[PDB]
């Protein structure tokens, strides 16, 4: 499927993933696309923070789901 992630900078990114795909796979894809380390990525959907070791279907993520992504860096 296709999901949309909006960052703190307002950038909207489309990710081609599946509901059965794990959170680790999505974080790895995000790291490949933008270089954000999986540990520094925080994803929020429907008031729930995505955690490693689970899948998108575990968070009731559906077609064109809107997620909030925040990256931690700097100092």
């Amino acid at each position: 499927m296709q999901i949309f992630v909006k960052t703190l900078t307002g950038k909207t990114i489309t990710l081609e993933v599946e509901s059965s795909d794990t959170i680790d796979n999505v974080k790895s894809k995000i790291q490949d696309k933008e270089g954000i380390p999986p540990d520094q990525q925080r994803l929020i959907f429907a008031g729930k923070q995505l955690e490693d070791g689970r899948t998108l279907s575990d968070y009731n993520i559906q077609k064109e789901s809107t997620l909030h992504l925040v990256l931690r860096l700097r100092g």
């Binding site: 900078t9 307002g10 270089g35 700097r74 100092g75």
Partner: protein, 377 residues
């Protein structure tokens, strides 16, 4: 390639019949101590025909050969003098991001137009005689010189936090809780004065249907309207030598390269003006780090500088007057972390944490991998 195009443009520009130097030599003697005063006394009275002749510069009581080096040193000193913020002509865009821009307070002088025309003449003379300054303005300045439209994104090159706030206002809805309206409070020597972006703008709150006009007015006022007369005088002085039909074949980056040459970061100054925590100047890690920096390309040095200090720009006086988030803070190197971990950085403190590695090759590999994601220059 980009370099080939820039070289072709430079050759075409200097091949124009309207930018050819004469054969007579114009002497120009300035004392080293009073460079700014003598330079302003001489340059601000020369004619356009005189400024197009060969520039021969002799420092007083300093007799020597290789007049090219003497002229380059004179231009370096003059550029570091006229553009120095302490002279109340230009100013850094932000304390922790050193970007020169025309200071709005410079209007306090009875006649700033003469000084800014002199600055324009200096820039035009530097470009005309194939000599380089050593300053680093902001991109909106170069865009203004070339007469390009300025938009919201241009505020990113000036101030990051201001641009982020403006983008937040653009994206998210603005409610009545915020006391935002069409007015700006500018503090000039203690007293604060209110400037209205639009007529009777101090009594017009921003709704959800006006925030676009508010952002447009704020961007125009911050980038252009606050420095109209001064920049007009500066551009008149600049175009007194270089016709506007010549500057308009470059862009905001090729003009920067033409004005300041290829940008490089000095390593000796960096080593002389740094401090160590839990480290000594004779430690193996420190000397290996300095050797690696010595044998490195400018792009990767700029990447490391941005990774450590948070920005790739330096103050007008090197690493001596280096500022942090709070105040002055020189580049700091500290021993922190386990051996396997990558080197870390603290940008708001200008700090670099390097674990105590065992071999120089491992240090180089870890440092390169750590600075990979940073984009410099």
């Amino acid at each position: 390639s980009h370099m080939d195009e820039y070289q072709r443009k430079i050759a075409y520009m200097y091949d124009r019949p309207e930018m050819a130097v004469n054969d007579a030599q114009l002497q120009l003697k300035v004392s080293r101590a009073t460079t700014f005063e003598d330079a302003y006394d001489i340059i601000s009275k020369l004619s356009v025909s005189d400024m197009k002749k060969k520039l021969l510069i002799r420092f007083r009581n300093e007799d020597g050969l290789d007049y090219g080096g003497v002229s380059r040193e004179f231009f370096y000193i003059l550029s570091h003098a006229i553009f120095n913020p302490g002279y109340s002509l230009f100013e850094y865009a932000t304390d922790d991001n050193y970007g020169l821009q025309i200071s709005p307070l410079s209007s306090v002088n009875p006649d700033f137009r003469s000084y800014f025309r002199f600055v324009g003449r200096v820039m035009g003379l530097a470009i005309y005689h194939r000599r380089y300054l050593d300053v680093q303005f902001v991109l909106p300045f170069y865009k203004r010189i070339l007469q390009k439209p300025l938009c919201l994104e241009d505020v990113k090159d000036v101030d990051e936090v201001y641009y982020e706030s403006l983008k937040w206002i653009k994206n998210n809805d603005v409610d009545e809780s915020l006391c935002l309206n069409f007015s700006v409070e500018e503090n000039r020597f203690g007293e604060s004065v209110t400037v209205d972006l639009i007529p009777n703008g101090r009594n017009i709150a921003v709704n959800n249907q006006n925030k676009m006009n508010y952002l447009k007015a704020l961007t125009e006022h911050k980038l252009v309207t606050s420095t109209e007369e001064q920049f007009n005088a500066l551009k008149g002085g600049l175009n007194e030598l270089i016709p506007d039909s010549v500057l308009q074949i470059f862009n905001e980056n090729e003009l920067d390269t033409l004005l300041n040459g290829k940008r490089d970061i000095d390593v000796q100054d960096w080593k002389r003006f740094t401090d160590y925590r839990s480290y000594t100047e004779t430690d193996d890690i420190v000397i290996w780090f300095w050797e690696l920096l010595s044998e490195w390309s400018p792009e990767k040095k700029a990447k490391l500088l941005q990774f450590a200090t948070g920005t790739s720009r330096l103050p007008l006086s090197g690493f001596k007057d280096m500022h942090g988030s709070d105040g002055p803070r020189k580049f700091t190197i500290e021993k922190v972390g386990h051996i396997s971990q990558l080197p870390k950085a603290h940008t708001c403190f200008n700090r670099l944490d390097i674990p105590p590695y065992n071999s120089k090759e491992e240090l180089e590999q870890k440092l390169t991998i750590a600075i990979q994601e940073t984009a410099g220059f």
